[PDB]
Amino acid sequence: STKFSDNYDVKEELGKGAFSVVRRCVHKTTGLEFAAKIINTKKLSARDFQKLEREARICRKLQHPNIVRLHDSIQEESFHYLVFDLVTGGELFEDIVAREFYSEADASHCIQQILESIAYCHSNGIVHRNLKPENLLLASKAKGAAVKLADFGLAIEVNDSEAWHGFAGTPGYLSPEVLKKDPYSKPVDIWACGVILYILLVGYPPFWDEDQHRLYAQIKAGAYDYPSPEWDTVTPEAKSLIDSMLTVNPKKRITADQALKVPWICNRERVASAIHRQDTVDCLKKFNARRKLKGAILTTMIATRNLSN
Amino acid sequence: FSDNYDVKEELGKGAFSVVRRCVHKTTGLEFAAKIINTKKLSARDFQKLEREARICRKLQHPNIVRLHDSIQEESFHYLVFDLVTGGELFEDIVAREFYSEADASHCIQQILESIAYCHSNGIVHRNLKPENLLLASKAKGAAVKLADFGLAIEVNDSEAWHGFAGTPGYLSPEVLKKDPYSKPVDIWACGVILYILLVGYPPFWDEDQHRLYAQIKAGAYDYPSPEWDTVTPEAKSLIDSMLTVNPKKRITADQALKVPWICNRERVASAIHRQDTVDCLKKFNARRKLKGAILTTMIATRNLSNLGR
């Protein structure tokens, strides 16, 4: 059919994916703007076609306000179009460092939205597997914009199955069960949520080591702490929530639904501290800068490979 | 700015600034806003920024990025330009099915018209290079636009040496000899670009800049066989008149626009497809993206260290 060409006006290119190009588009009737992932299905290899089918099915299931939603999936002659939310607010972590005031209450509001998106994924039998700063975006630059969970490239429909689904996810956010090659499921997203919450409170990660082997040993042992003096002003409730997420045995780890009912989340106005945390902002700026530098190094190596042939 | 525009998706990045699409609240008109962080700029730096704004506002031409407004707020400055979303010219050329001399001529004609306009207004760009040649959009027939007037100066009829500004591979002998220079430097750069547009590689290149600057001052370049054997003498003639060591003997933009290869490209410029040029241009762009990646890394390294101190 020609449902896309007749209903949408294609605008400028926003970027490129593994096997696609993304362009802004505007719905002719509603006038609403979206981000369209355009894929040439004929040229697609069999392997990538399978990846696409899985992506479209999973994204179709995930209809929640705190998730980068896929509006429509249209197949035309040789191209397929995946119409998604147009997210322009950038990384949550980059926005936080520009704030004049940032407190526990603000951290709680952020993690509450992330947990809502995760609880929704889990209720639909899907595990994201790649929660990290780069995938926590803001809908737009507008004040109060919603936190959006992005990139479901590694998501899988685990449902009620029991097995080890491989090593995927970023190294500082991986859970003990994945590293131990034990069966794992939805709880891995909660572990990552705990790592993110820790960073949201002090600006640096709980598991950190230049030696990858040491990092994984650290994670497997659940070896993190709350160093003075920065953590001396953090409430016991924030720490308790983190402890419930960074529980090594997945069977004793809190679920997203349960986390959303904890006072520090549900009654943040009273239970979460309202004090400004300048050191968190300062540390987070360095955390972001370090990530940007590693990313630039990676970009350079990829550029070197493209040149060399 | 914040009370009159709303920022949208990112269109690009660079030194201490990002370029994002923005929408004028009242009119609904779209523009490209260059957000510049000025928290560190000195009094003289701001003067240079106001210079760029002044120059751009003085330049209203169909082949030049048009500045709509210039606003300075708390810690940021905003330069609002028309939306230019076609990307870099060199990137678009390597994606064409057919690319001939006539196509290169059409590009050069547009670049010359933009330069002739600048020159007639007493302005010398000083930074004519690949990355500053953009296309209005992805549409066919999209006009070429001259961008980045960050180094442009109102030389008018004055004569003196204005410093070592610009990219080495495009620098003119006068500049390298520290002799007085003016509008002609843009013509020399245009000649280097024309040479690249025809075969895919630069006329002046070498390991160490010493020999590189040595061959430039001597105006020592060649038309190697077999690629140049299919290029018209008129194309080579125009290049020769642009790559003339003596500024006073170098062809002007107004003069170049009257050359048959330019004003009658349909007959004088070859129409044969130059696949070898497309292939070479791909490696040329790849090398360009690599250097850009190297620069980004150095910037990121500086940013991180700047925070530590």
UniProtKB/Swiss-Prot annotation, chain A:
Dodecamer. Subunits are tightly packed around a central ring-shaped scaffold with extensive contacts between the regulatory segment of one kinase and the catalytic domain of another enabling cooperative activation of a subunit by the adjacent molecule. Interacts with and phosphorylates daf-16; the interaction promotes daf-16 nuclear localization. Interacts with egl-2 and tir-1. Interacts with nsy-1. GO terms for biological process: MAPK cascade; medium-term memory; positive regulation of gene expression; regulation of neuronal synaptic plasticity; regulation of protein localization to plasma membrane; serotonin biosynthetic process. This is Calcium/calmodulin-dependent protein kinase type II. Keywords: ATP-binding, Calmodulin-binding, Cell projection, Cytoplasm, Kinase, Magnesium, Metal-binding, Nucleotide-binding, Phosphoprotein, Serine/threonine-protein kinase, Stress response, Transferase. Changing H276K: Increase in calcium independent kinase activity, no effect on translocation to the neurite. It is found in: Cytoplasm; Cell projection, Axon; Perikaryon. The active site is at N130 (proton acceptor). The keyword Cell membrane does not apply. GO terms for molecular function: ATP binding; calcium/calmodulin-dependent protein kinase activity; calmodulin binding; identical protein binding; metal ion binding; protein serine kinase activity; transmembrane transporter binding. ATP binds at L14, G15, K16, G17, A18, F19, S20, V21, V22, K37. Acts in the signaling of a variety of pathways and processes. Phosphorylates 'Ser-319' of daf-16 in response to stress signals, such as heat, starvation and oxidation, which plays a role in prolonging lifespan. Required for viability under chronic osmotic stress in which it acts downstream of osr-1. Has roles in locomotion, oocyte maturation, brood size, egg laying, defecation, meiotic maturation and neuronal cell fate specification. Required for the regulation of synaptic density and neuromuscular junction morphology. Regulates the synaptic trafficking of glr-1. Expressed in the nervous system. Observed in the ADF and AWC neurons. Position in AWC neurons is regulated by microtubules. Localized to clusters in ventral cord neurites which appear to be required for glr-1 trafficking. Also present in oocytes. The keyword Phosphoprotein applies. Changing R277E: Increase in calcium independent kinase activity and translocation to an unlocalized pool in the neurite. Small decrease in glr-1 trafficking. Disruption phenotype: Increased frequency of defecation, typified by a weaker repetition of the defecation motor program, an echo, 10 s after the primary motor program. Abnormal spicule protraction. Lack of tph-1 transcriptional up-regulation during learned olfactory aversion to bacteria. Reduced brood size, body length and width. Lethargic movement. A gain-of function mutation reduces locomotory activity, alters excitation of three muscle types and lengthens the period of the motor output of a behavioral clock. Both classes of mutation inhibit neurotransmitter release. The modification Phosphothreonine is found at T280. Its main location: cytoplasm. Belongs to the protein kinase superfamily. CAMK Ser/Thr protein kinase family. CaMK subfamily.
